[PDB]
Every structure is written in C-alpha cells, then in structure tokens.
C-alpha cells in the first residue's frame, strides 16, 4: 500500500482533497503539502494539522489565537498528532508520522489553522 | 441566508464536497446535482440521497439491491428524506425539500446508492 | 440580583464554569446552556443537570445506562432538581427552576450525563 | 460439525440473528462479531455477551451502569461466560470459549450491554 499523499493549498483557502485514507499496514505515513498559489505566507498561509475530531476546534481556536510567528499553533499542544509547517506560495513541506499514533475506531480530522479558514477547509482521515 | 447548494459527482465516484450546511432560517433547501464526468449513468451514475445517519446503512443496502431500474432506491423507502434522481454524464437534477423535515439534535447524512460507492462517497448535512 | 447564568459546553467535554451561585432573593433561576463546538449531539452531547451532591452519582450512572434516546436521563428520576435537554453543536437550551427547591445547608452539584464525562465535568451550585 | 458463527450488529441497535446453535461435539466455539454500520462505538457500540438466562438481567444492569471505558461490563463479572469487546463501525472482534462451560439442561442467552439496547437485542444460544 502507498503510505504517502500529495495535498495542495491554493489562494482560495482550499485543500484539493477532503478525505485521506491511511492503510493500517503503513508503519509511517507522509503528507506532502504544497502551495501552488501566488500569495505569500502572511496573507495566505497553509498548514496541514492532524488531531482527533474532538480536539480539532481547540487546536484551531488556540492556534489562530497564537499568531503568525507561532505558525498559528499553540506551543506544546499535545492535541496535535502531526502537522506541517505553515507555507506560502511556491513552498512545500512534508510531515511523516507514525501510524501507531492512530487508533481503530477513533475519528480524526485534518485541517489548516491560518485565520479566515472556512468550515470546509478540513477533511477526514480514516484508517483502511 | 442562502438556501441552496451545487453538488458535482465525477468519474472517480466522488462528490466534490462532504459537508453541506443548511441555514436554520431556510424554509426550503435545494440541492443542484450535476455530473460533469464523461461516463454514462449505467457505469458512473450518481444520486444525492438524504437520511438520518442511522438510516444510511439500510437505505444504501436496500437501494443498491433494487437495481438500475429503480434508481437504486428501495420503493417506498420512508427513511429517504429527500433525493435526486440517478444521473449520468451531462445530466443535472435538483431536489427541494422542506427544512421542517430536519430536527435539531439529529444527525443527517447525504450519500450515493450507485453500486461500488466507497465508504467515503457521502457527507454530513448539518443545520446551522 | 441577577437570576441567570450563561454556560457553554465544548468539543472537549467541558463546561466553561465549575461553580454557579444562586442568590437567595431569586424566586426563579435560569441556566442558559449553549454548545459552541463543531461536534453533533450523538458524539458530543451536553446537558446541564442539577441534583444534590449525594444523588449525583446515581443520576449519572442510571442516566448513562438509559441511552441517547432518553437524553441519558433515567425517566421519572425524582433526584433531578432541574435539567436542560441534551444539545449538540450549534444548539442552545435554557432551563428555569424554582429557587425554593434549594435548601440552605445542602450541597448541590451540576453536571453532564453524556457518557465519557470526566470526574471534572461537573461543578458546585451554592446559595448566596 | 462447524464450531463458529458470524454475527453482525447494525446501525439500528440489532443483531442479524436471535438464535445460535452450538454442536455438542464442538470442543471450542467461536463467535465472529462485525459492525457493518456507519456509526461509531460511542453512539452505536455492539458487544456479544454470553451468560445463563437468569444472569442476563444482572449482567445488563451492572454492565450498562459500568460505563464506556469498561466496555459496559462490570469488572470481574463471574456471570459472563464469554464476550467480545465493544466494537463500532468497521470493527470486528472474535471470541473463542470452551464448550465445557455449557451444561445440558441449562438455558443460555447472548446479548449486548450498550445503553439503549431494546428487550429484543438478544438471542438464545443452544447446545445441539
Ligand atoms: Cu505498502
Ligand atoms: Cu490553509
Ligand atoms: Cu435567507
Ligand atoms: Cu455517486
Ligand atoms: Cu435581583
Ligand atoms: Cu457534557
Ligand atoms: Cu466438527
Ligand atoms: Cu448491540
């Protein structure tokens, strides 16, 4: 099974996917985030952040509240299972995490914590 | 508030969204389903079907079993709150339903009953 | 004095207060519960339930055992002094009760009976 | 004789069967429980629990009262002859037990201890 996915965020505050599957045979999984937009990180930043569905709102709220210099993530936020850095136009960033950190049955969500994010700038992550 | 949404189904057996919001002040709500793919209805049919989250399994199971000639919906399925017809490439169909059929605190799902739909070929419909 | 308080429950199974005061000059008192989270009632429900400290465990235990269809409250539970209904993301519910139901010297607790509730998902209610 | 059975729980709080037969020549018997529903364990959990018909009431009452974190079973319940873990959508669990635990002339029941179970959410297990 493939153990990596390629995700893009654009100038419209949109990922080009709303659902990621992670095969349970993968020991590590890698998300390759890129930004094919024109706008710089300060005005149109994207990151890819993973948490349980219950923690998502808190991660996003405290993250926006932390500011750009903190990558819009609260420091030492244990709710964050994995994340990329925040990136602007023409940048890329990959995160590899251990799939064992995921549990069968639990509900996981991926999302971006740059302020202005819509209710749909998020997605499901599911084991298969 | 707006009381309609445009949904597209594609040639990879997907919807372009997995989350629809229905403003609570809407008396009626309209889903505009379109099929911009190239594949005909008998190989890549899409419908948009709404039920409670708990009823989705039964609607999907009985519907897929009812055949192309019934639009893959069990006849007289009272669990189906609203639905479009099954469409192929270049077809469109709209459904309008009364928002009083939705109840606060209840969870609702939209999905597709054409055989072969993955577990991810569905979404949440939520009152806001 | 004021005879109302505004309480919020989130996606972390948390209230935003652990202590409510009720002025003895209030003839009625109103709890305004809201759910600013993103998660639906079936996975992340909240209610606000009031009982003596001694009855709380039994209310909670028999409530969880009653299931979601009964709002996680045992029917005809005479230990329940006052309660809101169970609510999910985007919902609100208010309960007004007669302050005369409270007696000086007695210890009262407020809490939530949705399962998974931690031993901190409660709070004191005190006359002043 | 075959010494195993496949059992499904669904999103309507039901098993697919209400009657299991265990051939008396079986030395071990295996129950393969699965959850083809869409709803998670905290909203639509299923377990398969075996006891005498007389012990069913106590196991259910004590179990449902024991909470999601104990899989809705009283700790160290000597009445439980065999059980699967509690599973949600997409999960599966198997239990194998010694048939010498069953005695001729006794009556046995299987059931589920997830709160909200109906009186029909159960079945007979019979030596044959
Ligand atoms: Cu592989
Ligand atoms: Cu973003
Ligand atoms: Cu309007
Ligand atoms: Cu479809
Ligand atoms: Cu006053
Ligand atoms: Cu609560
Ligand atoms: Cu045999
Ligand atoms: Cu069950």
Find the CATH number of the domain harbouring B23.
Answer: 2.60.40.420
Chains that touch D (3 or more CB pairs under 8 A): A, B, C
DSSP chain D: ---EEEEEB-TTS-BS-SEEEE-TT-SEEEEEEE--SSS-HHHH-B--EEEETTTHHHHHHHHHTT-GGGTTS-TT-TT--EEPPPB-TT-EEEEEEEGGGS-TT--EEEE--STT--TTSEEEEEE-
Taking CB atoms and an 8 Å cut-off, how many pairs form between chains A and B? Answer: 15
Q: Which domain holds residue A20?
A: 4-127
B55 — contact with chain D (CB < 8 Å)?
yes
**Residue D40: φ, ψ to 5°:** -70, 170
End-to-end CA distance of chain C: 10
Site from B103, B105, B107, B109 to mutate, C interface, most C CB atoms within 10 angstroms: B105
> Using CA atoms, how far apart are residues B118 and B122, in angstroms rounded to an integer?
9
Angle in degrees, CA D120, D122, D123, rounded to 5? 110
Longest CA–CA separation in chain B, Å: 39
* C14 Cα–ligand 6 center, Å: 6
Tell me if D115 sits within 8 A of D10, measured CB to CB. no
**Alpha carbon of D116 to those of A90, B40, C62, C71, C115: distances in Å?**
53, 44, 12, 10, 12
Resolution of the deposited coordinates, in angstroms?
Answer: 2.0
Structural domains counted in chain A:
1
Identify the experimental approach: X-ray
> Is the distance from CB of D84 to CB of D29 less than 8 angstroms?
no
Q: In sequence order, which residues have a C-beta less than 8 Å from that of residue B78 and are 6 or more positions away?
A: none
| D60 alpha carbon, closest ligand | 8
Q: Which residues pair with A4 in a beta bridge?
A: A30
Give the tokens for residue C13: 């199974």
CB contact under 8 A, C41 and B128: no
Strands A4-8 and A92-98: unpaired
Quick check: C115 and D115 CB within 8 A? yes
A125 CA to centre of ligand 1 in angstroms: 18
Give phi and psi for A9, each to the nearest 5.
Answer: -115, 140
Q: Nearest CB to A57: which of C13, C38, C43?
A: C38
Distance C25 CA to ligand 5 centre (A): 7
CA nearest B126 in A: which residue?
A119
User: Residue A6 CB: number of other CB atoms within 10 A?
Assistant: 13
DSSP class per residue in A34-74: E--SSS-HHHH-B--EEEETTTHHHHHHHHHHH-GGGTTS-
Distance CA B81, CA D58 (A): 40
Q: What residues in D contact A104, CB-CB < 8 Å?
A: 90-91
For chain B, give the DSSP string.
---EEEEEB-TTS-BS-SEEEE-TT-SEEEEEEE--SSS-HHHH-B--EEEETTTHHHHHHHHHTT-GGGTTS-TT-TT--EEPPPB-TT-EEEEEEEGGGS-TT--EEEE--STT--TTSEEEEEE-
Ligand 2 centre from A116 Cα, in Å?
9
């Amino acid at each position: 099974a493939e153990c990596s996915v390629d995700i893009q965020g654009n100038d419209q505050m949109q990922f080009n996917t709303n659902a990621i599957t992670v095969d349970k045979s993968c020991k590590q999984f890698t998300v390759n985030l890129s930004h094919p937009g024109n706008l710089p990180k300060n005005v149109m930043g994207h990151n890819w952040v993973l948490s349980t569905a219950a923690d998502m709102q808190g991660v996003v709220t405290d993250g926006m509240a932390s500011g750009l210099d903190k990558d819009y993530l609260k420091p030492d936020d244990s709710r964050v299972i994995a994340h990329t850095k925040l990136i602007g136009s023409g940048e890329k960033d990959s995160v590899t995490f251990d799939v064992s950190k995921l549990k069968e049955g639990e509900q996981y969500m991926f999302f971006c914590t740059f302020p202005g994010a819509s209710a749909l700038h998020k997605g499901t992550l599911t084991l298969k």
